[PDB]
PDB file of C-alpha atoms and ligand atoms in Angstrom:
ATOM      1  CA  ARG A  17     -46.760  13.413 -12.572  1.00 30.26           C
ATOM      2  CA  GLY A  18     -43.731  11.221 -11.897  1.00 32.12           C
ATOM      3  CA  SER A  19     -40.622  10.379 -13.879  1.00 32.40           C
ATOM      4  CA  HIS A  20     -40.878   8.652 -17.242  1.00 31.45           C
ATOM      5  CA  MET A  21     -38.257   6.562 -19.012  1.00 33.22           C
ATOM      6  CA  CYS A  22     -38.366   9.016 -21.904  1.00 33.05           C
ATOM      7  CA  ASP A  23     -37.082  11.734 -19.563  1.00 30.47           C
ATOM      8  CA  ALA A  24     -33.684  10.324 -20.616  1.00 31.67           C
ATOM      9  CA  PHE A  25     -34.066  12.341 -23.843  1.00 33.67           C
ATOM     10  CA  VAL A  26     -34.895  15.623 -22.100  1.00 31.96           C
ATOM     11  CA  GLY A  27     -32.350  18.393 -22.358  1.00 32.05           C
ATOM     12  CA  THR A  28     -30.300  20.571 -24.677  1.00 33.89           C
ATOM     13  CA  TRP A  29     -28.201  18.770 -27.287  1.00 35.90           C
ATOM     14  CA  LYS A  30     -25.680  19.817 -29.940  1.00 36.09           C
ATOM     15  CA  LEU A  31     -24.684  17.986 -33.126  1.00 37.59           C
ATOM     16  CA  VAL A  32     -21.115  16.692 -32.935  1.00 38.92           C
ATOM     17  CA  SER A  33     -20.914  14.238 -35.860  1.00 40.22           C
ATOM     18  CA  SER A  34     -22.776  13.401 -39.048  1.00 38.71           C
ATOM     19  CA  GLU A  35     -22.150  10.425 -41.324  1.00 36.41           C
ATOM     20  CA  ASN A  36     -23.645   9.821 -44.786  1.00 33.98           C
ATOM     21  CA  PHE A  37     -26.305  12.520 -44.383  1.00 35.64           C
ATOM     22  CA  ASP A  38     -25.768  13.847 -47.909  1.00 34.56           C
ATOM     23  CA  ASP A  39     -26.543  10.456 -49.463  1.00 35.53           C
ATOM     24  CA  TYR A  40     -29.531  10.059 -47.131  1.00 35.11           C
ATOM     25  CA  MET A  41     -30.841  13.461 -48.234  1.00 34.55           C
ATOM     26  CA  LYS A  42     -30.371  12.506 -51.890  1.00 37.32           C
ATOM     27  CA  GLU A  43     -32.490   9.403 -51.341  1.00 37.92           C
ATOM     28  CA  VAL A  44     -35.147  11.481 -49.569  1.00 39.81           C
ATOM     29  CA  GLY A  45     -35.257  13.712 -52.652  1.00 38.34           C
ATOM     30  CA  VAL A  46     -33.711  16.888 -51.225  1.00 36.90           C
ATOM     31  CA  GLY A  47     -32.587  19.304 -53.923  1.00 35.34           C
ATOM     32  CA  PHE A  48     -29.001  20.401 -54.428  1.00 32.13           C
ATOM     33  CA  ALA A  49     -29.088  23.800 -52.725  1.00 27.79           C
ATOM     34  CA  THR A  50     -31.026  22.609 -49.680  1.00 29.50           C
ATOM     35  CA  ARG A  51     -28.724  19.583 -49.329  1.00 28.15           C
ATOM     36  CA  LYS A  52     -25.663  21.824 -49.303  1.00 25.97           C
ATOM     37  CA  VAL A  53     -27.028  24.350 -46.806  1.00 28.33           C
ATOM     38  CA  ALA A  54     -28.756  21.780 -44.583  1.00 27.92           C
ATOM     39  CA  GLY A  55     -25.680  19.549 -44.552  1.00 26.90           C
ATOM     40  CA  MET A  56     -23.581  22.448 -43.228  1.00 28.13           C
ATOM     41  CA  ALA A  57     -25.910  23.001 -40.275  1.00 28.50           C
ATOM     42  CA  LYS A  58     -24.856  22.012 -36.760  1.00 28.25           C
ATOM     43  CA  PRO A  59     -28.213  22.165 -34.988  1.00 28.88           C
ATOM     44  CA  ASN A  60     -29.047  22.241 -31.338  1.00 27.61           C
ATOM     45  CA  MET A  61     -31.872  19.925 -30.335  1.00 25.91           C
ATOM     46  CA  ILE A  62     -34.045  20.772 -27.332  1.00 27.98           C
ATOM     47  CA  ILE A  63     -36.272  17.979 -26.014  1.00 29.48           C
ATOM     48  CA  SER A  64     -38.878  18.405 -23.306  1.00 32.73           C
ATOM     49  CA  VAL A  65     -41.657  16.258 -21.866  1.00 35.00           C
ATOM     50  CA  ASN A  66     -44.818  17.710 -20.334  1.00 35.86           C
ATOM     51  CA  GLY A  67     -47.378  15.089 -19.393  1.00 35.41           C
ATOM     52  CA  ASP A  68     -48.045  12.971 -22.471  1.00 34.17           C
ATOM     53  CA  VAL A  69     -46.662  15.610 -24.866  1.00 32.79           C
ATOM     54  CA  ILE A  70     -43.090  15.367 -26.116  1.00 33.69           C
ATOM     55  CA  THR A  71     -41.617  18.456 -27.771  1.00 32.29           C
ATOM     56  CA  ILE A  72     -38.531  18.313 -29.996  1.00 32.20           C
ATOM     57  CA  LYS A  73     -37.138  21.666 -31.124  1.00 32.01           C
ATOM     58  CA  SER A  74     -34.208  22.107 -33.464  1.00 32.64           C
ATOM     59  CA  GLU A  75     -32.327  25.372 -33.874  1.00 32.62           C
ATOM     60  CA  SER A  76     -29.661  26.020 -36.467  1.00 33.39           C
ATOM     61  CA  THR A  77     -28.455  28.546 -38.990  1.00 33.06           C
ATOM     62  CA  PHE A  78     -30.480  26.620 -41.586  1.00 31.34           C
ATOM     63  CA  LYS A  79     -33.924  26.355 -39.984  1.00 31.76           C
ATOM     64  CA  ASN A  80     -35.679  26.433 -36.643  1.00 31.80           C
ATOM     65  CA  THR A  81     -38.278  23.701 -36.207  1.00 30.76           C
ATOM     66  CA  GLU A  82     -40.549  22.412 -33.471  1.00 28.71           C
ATOM     67  CA  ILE A  83     -42.747  19.324 -33.251  1.00 25.93           C
ATOM     68  CA  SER A  84     -44.980  18.362 -30.340  1.00 25.02           C
ATOM     69  CA  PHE A  85     -46.611  14.959 -30.273  1.00 21.71           C
ATOM     70  CA  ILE A  86     -48.125  12.140 -28.247  1.00 22.57           C
ATOM     71  CA  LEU A  87     -46.631   8.686 -28.731  1.00 21.04           C
ATOM     72  CA  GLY A  88     -48.581   6.583 -31.215  1.00 21.12           C
ATOM     73  CA  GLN A  89     -50.674   9.520 -32.488  1.00 20.05           C
ATOM     74  CA  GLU A  90     -50.123  10.700 -36.063  1.00 19.93           C
ATOM     75  CA  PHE A  91     -49.431  14.392 -36.688  1.00 22.58           C
ATOM     76  CA  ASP A  92     -48.647  16.795 -39.526  1.00 20.91           C
ATOM     77  CA  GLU A  93     -45.002  17.817 -39.791  1.00 21.50           C
ATOM     78  CA  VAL A  94     -43.314  20.349 -42.050  1.00 23.21           C
ATOM     79  CA  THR A  95     -39.706  19.191 -42.077  1.00 20.49           C
ATOM     80  CA  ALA A  96     -36.624  21.425 -42.126  1.00 23.38           C
ATOM     81  CA  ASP A  97     -36.208  20.673 -45.847  1.00 23.62           C
ATOM     82  CA  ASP A  98     -39.865  21.730 -46.447  1.00 24.60           C
ATOM     83  CA  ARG A  99     -41.545  18.366 -46.914  1.00 24.33           C
ATOM     84  CA  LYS A 100     -45.135  18.203 -45.665  1.00 26.60           C
ATOM     85  CA  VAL A 101     -45.246  14.770 -44.057  1.00 27.71           C
ATOM     86  CA  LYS A 102     -47.454  12.610 -41.891  1.00 26.38           C
ATOM     87  CA  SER A 103     -45.452  11.549 -38.842  1.00 22.98           C
ATOM     88  CA  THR A 104     -45.972   8.942 -36.138  1.00 23.91           C
ATOM     89  CA  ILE A 105     -43.533   8.496 -33.264  1.00 19.37           C
ATOM     90  CA  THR A 106     -43.544   5.515 -30.909  1.00 19.17           C
ATOM     91  CA  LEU A 107     -41.304   4.204 -28.133  1.00 18.82           C
ATOM     92  CA  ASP A 108     -39.807   0.764 -28.810  1.00 18.15           C
ATOM     93  CA  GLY A 109     -37.591  -0.533 -26.014  1.00 20.63           C
ATOM     94  CA  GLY A 110     -36.213   2.878 -25.114  1.00 18.55           C
ATOM     95  CA  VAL A 111     -35.872   4.032 -28.739  1.00 15.88           C
ATOM     96  CA  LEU A 112     -38.001   6.793 -30.235  1.00 14.31           C
ATOM     97  CA  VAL A 113     -39.072   5.488 -33.644  1.00 13.89           C
ATOM     98  CA  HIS A 114     -40.277   8.226 -36.005  1.00 12.52           C
ATOM     99  CA  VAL A 115     -41.826   7.391 -39.380  1.00 14.13           C
ATOM    100  CA  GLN A 116     -42.391  10.179 -41.926  1.00 16.30           C
ATOM    101  CA  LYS A 117     -44.695   9.522 -44.893  1.00 18.41           C
ATOM    102  CA  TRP A 118     -45.181  11.749 -47.931  1.00 18.45           C
ATOM    103  CA  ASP A 119     -45.762  11.435 -51.691  1.00 19.59           C
ATOM    104  CA  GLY A 120     -45.881   7.646 -51.429  1.00 22.19           C
ATOM    105  CA  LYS A 121     -42.471   7.563 -49.712  1.00 18.01           C
ATOM    106  CA  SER A 122     -41.453   6.859 -46.153  1.00 15.95           C
ATOM    107  CA  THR A 123     -38.365   7.278 -43.994  1.00 13.28           C
ATOM    108  CA  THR A 124     -37.622   6.132 -40.447  1.00 17.09           C
ATOM    109  CA  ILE A 125     -35.694   8.175 -37.879  1.00 15.87           C
ATOM    110  CA  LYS A 126     -34.584   6.476 -34.667  1.00 11.34           C
ATOM    111  CA  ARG A 127     -33.419   8.497 -31.668  1.00 13.61           C
ATOM    112  CA  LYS A 128     -31.757   6.710 -28.783  1.00 12.56           C
ATOM    113  CA  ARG A 129     -29.569   7.345 -25.781  1.00 13.69           C
ATOM    114  CA  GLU A 130     -26.104   5.782 -25.925  1.00 12.22           C
ATOM    115  CA  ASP A 131     -23.637   6.589 -23.132  1.00 13.97           C
ATOM    116  CA  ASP A 132     -23.975  10.383 -22.669  1.00 15.44           C
ATOM    117  CA  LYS A 133     -24.935  10.870 -26.321  1.00 17.95           C
ATOM    118  CA  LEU A 134     -28.166  11.122 -28.263  1.00 15.46           C
ATOM    119  CA  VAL A 135     -27.782   9.070 -31.443  1.00 17.30           C
ATOM    120  CA  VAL A 136     -30.038   9.682 -34.451  1.00 19.20           C
ATOM    121  CA  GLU A 137     -30.120   6.959 -37.117  1.00 15.84           C
ATOM    122  CA  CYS A 138     -32.243   7.450 -40.202  1.00 17.34           C
ATOM    123  CA  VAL A 139     -32.887   5.208 -43.176  1.00 19.91           C
ATOM    124  CA  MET A 140     -34.359   5.824 -46.622  1.00 20.53           C
ATOM    125  CA  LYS A 141     -34.534   2.980 -49.180  1.00 21.34           C
ATOM    126  CA  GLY A 142     -31.429   1.238 -47.863  1.00 21.69           C
ATOM    127  CA  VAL A 143     -29.375   4.408 -47.278  1.00 20.67           C
ATOM    128  CA  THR A 144     -28.610   5.102 -43.601  1.00 20.09           C
ATOM    129  CA  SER A 145     -27.185   8.167 -41.882  1.00 23.79           C
ATOM    130  CA  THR A 146     -25.955   8.446 -38.293  1.00 23.04           C
ATOM    131  CA  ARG A 147     -25.885  11.785 -36.482  1.00 25.38           C
ATOM    132  CA  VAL A 148     -24.572  12.084 -32.926  1.00 26.25           C
ATOM    133  CA  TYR A 149     -25.555  14.773 -30.421  1.00 26.21           C
ATOM    134  CA  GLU A 150     -23.915  15.608 -27.103  1.00 30.33           C
ATOM    135  CA  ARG A 151     -25.176  17.597 -24.129  1.00 29.98           C
ATOM    136  CA  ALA A 152     -24.871  21.304 -24.856  1.00 28.22           C
TER     137      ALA A 152
HETATM  138  C1  8JO B   1     -30.747  20.245 -41.031  1.00 28.59           C
HETATM  139  O1  8JO B   1     -31.433  19.514 -42.049  1.00 28.59           O
HETATM  140  C2  8JO B   1     -32.441  18.683 -41.645  1.00 28.59           C
HETATM  141  C3  8JO B   1     -32.943  18.657 -40.370  1.00 28.59           C
HETATM  142  C4  8JO B   1     -33.964  17.764 -40.026  1.00 28.59           C
HETATM  143  C5  8JO B   1     -34.470  16.903 -40.965  1.00 28.59           C
HETATM  144  S1  8JO B   1     -35.733  15.794 -40.400  1.00 28.59           S
HETATM  145  O2  8JO B   1     -36.783  15.702 -41.371  1.00 28.59           O
HETATM  146  O3  8JO B   1     -36.096  16.176 -39.070  1.00 28.59           O
HETATM  147  N1  8JO B   1     -35.037  14.320 -40.314  1.00 28.59           N
HETATM  148  C6  8JO B   1     -33.833  14.018 -39.618  1.00 28.59           C
HETATM  149  C7  8JO B   1     -33.139  12.865 -39.944  1.00 28.59           C
HETATM  150  C8  8JO B   1     -31.952  12.562 -39.296  1.00 28.59           C
HETATM  151  C9  8JO B   1     -31.478  13.435 -38.345  1.00 28.59           C
HETATM  152  F1  8JO B   1     -30.316  13.117 -37.726  1.00 28.59           F
HETATM  153  C10 8JO B   1     -32.127  14.606 -38.004  1.00 28.59           C
HETATM  154  C11 8JO B   1     -31.572  15.559 -36.972  1.00 28.59           C
HETATM  155  O4  8JO B   1     -30.331  15.672 -36.894  1.00 28.59           O
HETATM  156  O5  8JO B   1     -32.373  16.194 -36.262  1.00 28.59           O
HETATM  157  C12 8JO B   1     -33.328  14.892 -38.652  1.00 28.59           C
HETATM  158  C13 8JO B   1     -33.961  16.875 -42.302  1.00 28.59           C
HETATM  159  C14 8JO B   1     -34.451  15.984 -43.292  1.00 28.59           C
HETATM  160  C15 8JO B   1     -33.934  16.000 -44.554  1.00 28.59           C
HETATM  161  C16 8JO B   1     -32.915  16.906 -44.893  1.00 28.59           C
HETATM  162  C17 8JO B   1     -32.414  17.781 -43.969  1.00 28.59           C
HETATM  163  C18 8JO B   1     -32.923  17.789 -42.648  1.00 28.59           C
END
């Protein structure tokens, strides 16, 4: 197998900034104690590509998580804040677009490369958060 555009995401990343994540989590419905502990976390994100399968791992003092998926193919995800969601991730012009659906709600997480950073932008009912990762 040859190179893929999404190889731009592959590597080991560390959170360096987080904006408005508490308000995003409130909109998602995250309870007080989980919001406080999850908001403190400075996760590492490890992204790998093997054939058609993309794996995104997150490691932090709060939770360790791993999802593996094929673009366009829905999967079951248990999120770090313990939602059981249906997730679909697609590639739109270089941007990984991740929709989570649960309990009649939905949120969108976009992951994109900007300069040497990995930028994560998420939105829930008009509330956006931006989290920036750098190479570890
Ligand atoms: C460390 O507490 C979390 C880790 C992960 C998730 S999530 O369900 O994976 N969605 C998401 C949204 C924006 C982001 F920037 C990232 C990220 O930084 O990876 C992840 C969380 C969702 C709700 C509350 C806390 C979350």
